[PDB]
Amino acid sequence: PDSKCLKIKVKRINLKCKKSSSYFVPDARSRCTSVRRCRWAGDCQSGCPPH
Amino acid sequence: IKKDGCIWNADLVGIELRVDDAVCYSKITSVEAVANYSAIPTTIGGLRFER
Numbered sequence: 001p002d003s004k005c006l007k008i009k010v011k012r013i014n015l016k017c018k019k020s021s022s023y024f025v026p027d028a029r030s031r032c033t034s035v036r037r038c039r040w041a042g043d044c045q046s047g048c049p050p051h
Numbered sequence: 052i053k054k055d056g057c058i059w060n061a062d063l064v065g066i067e068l069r070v071d072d073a074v075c076y077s078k079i080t081s082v083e084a085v086a087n088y089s090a091i092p093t094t095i096g097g098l099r100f101e102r
């Protein structure tokens with residue numbers, strides 16, 4: 001004779017946007033080091049990288 | 052002015068010869084040869100460049 005129902009409840013209708021992509025951008029700093037050496041051989045004849 | 056550290060592209064010294072002479076002339080200009088060569092006291096514009 002009868003059956004149950006299905007209720008739909010709506011509370012808020014806000015203006016949002018989609019999600020094209022998702023990522024994380026961290027904070028970075030400046031860190032560096034060097035070393036002072038001498039030629040003393042044929043490894044530093046003219047330049048550091050040959051080609 | 053030895054090699055292994057000094058860099059030159061091309062056409063910095065000329066060669067001339069008539070009969071087994073092979074005389075070489077100079078093409079290098081000194082520092083006081085280009086235009087807009089200022090000195091220690093400089094007042095170009097509103098800035099007064101001192102030392």
Ligand SMILES: *[C@@H]1O[C@H](CO)[C@@H](O)[C@H](O)[C@H]1NC(C)=O
Binds near residue numbers: 086087
């Ligand atoms: C010297 O300076 C003037 C004015 O700034 C400029 O017009 C001229 O091209 C400069 N000379 C050179 C060789 O750059």
